[PDB]
Design a protein around this ligand. Sequence first.
Ligand code: HEC
Ligand code: HEC
Ligand SMILES: [Zn+2]
Ligand SMILES: [Zn+2]
Lengths: 136, 136
Amino acid sequence: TKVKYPDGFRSWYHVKSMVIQPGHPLENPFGGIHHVYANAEAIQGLRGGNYPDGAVLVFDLFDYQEDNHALVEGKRKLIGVMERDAKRFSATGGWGYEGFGEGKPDKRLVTDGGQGCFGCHAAQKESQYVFSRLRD
Amino acid sequence: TKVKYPDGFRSWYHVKSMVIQPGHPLENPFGGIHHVYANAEAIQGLRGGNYPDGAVLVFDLFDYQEDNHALVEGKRKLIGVMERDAKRFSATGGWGYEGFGEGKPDKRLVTDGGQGCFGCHAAQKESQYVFSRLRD
Ligand code: HEC
Ligand code: HEC
Ligand SMILES: [Zn+2]
Ligand SMILES: [Zn+2]
């Protein structure tokens, strides 16, 4: 019961983006420009429906470079993945959590069954462990 | 001929993003966090093919707020649109250029037939006048 690498995630629905800069509490390890993506099943859940099993959310994290009052996307640091399965991932609230170093399928990062990821996302119990909100 | 409003662009392919902060040359009016989206026809040109008629690129521009060293997306300021049609938009190199204030269909920003946008995009004549490049 590993989380699947979310192949083709780059062509999913772009939910939102955020920049975390030096100084911010999450600078380590979430510093950079991040983009959130969702497959069709996650949109149902994001829209106010419930999350079908098979819903995947992706946090895509880039380093950035300062270029004359512009922040420009550099190298991918990692992707974080949440994969909905109420039964398979019941231990961390129905979502499996995984990280892939630099987005690579072979650089699995999570060593504790997702407990560490889950400890922070649990703050969002009432929105089903998802921080991002859909926007227009 | 008017550039058509690109309905549904938000569910298109996310090409890339960039932040333009106060002091950048493009600050006025392109300051903020922007995301580039491309329809299926535009992806063909991005991938090295010719841009077919009906290709559409969108520049989606948000204001942002700086909050404890995070940049957080606020309100949409505008979208910029490029619509491909070699015949109808030959005057501006085969792309029609339009701005929609706040992303609303009824707030057209361009008043000079697109020559102002074309004047700068012509620098990238070699790339069919598109600055953005597909990244992974
Ligand atoms: C707090 C200390 C966190 C830890 C540890 C982890 N995550 Fe997280 N995550 C956090 C915030 C504040 C957000 C919202 C970001 C935004 O732009 O709003 C997120 C987001 C995600 C997402 C996108 C879906 C969502 O919940 O908004 C995914 C797919 C995600 N996170 C996965 C993830 C994994 C796999 C983690 C451990 C390796 C992990 N997160 C840790 C806060 C925190
Ligand atoms: C230089 C002074 C510019 C003027 C005037 C206009 N644009 Fe532009 N545009 C510019 C750059 C450097 C970029 C790339 C930004 C990035 O993230 O790399 C853009 C981008 C676009 C896009 C996205 C597709 C692409 O070419 O990368 C669109 C749809 C776009 N611009 C439209 C547009 C319109 C409608 C303009 C006049 C209202 C316009 N642009 C002006 C540089 C400049
Ligand atoms: Zn900083
Ligand atoms: Zn300066």
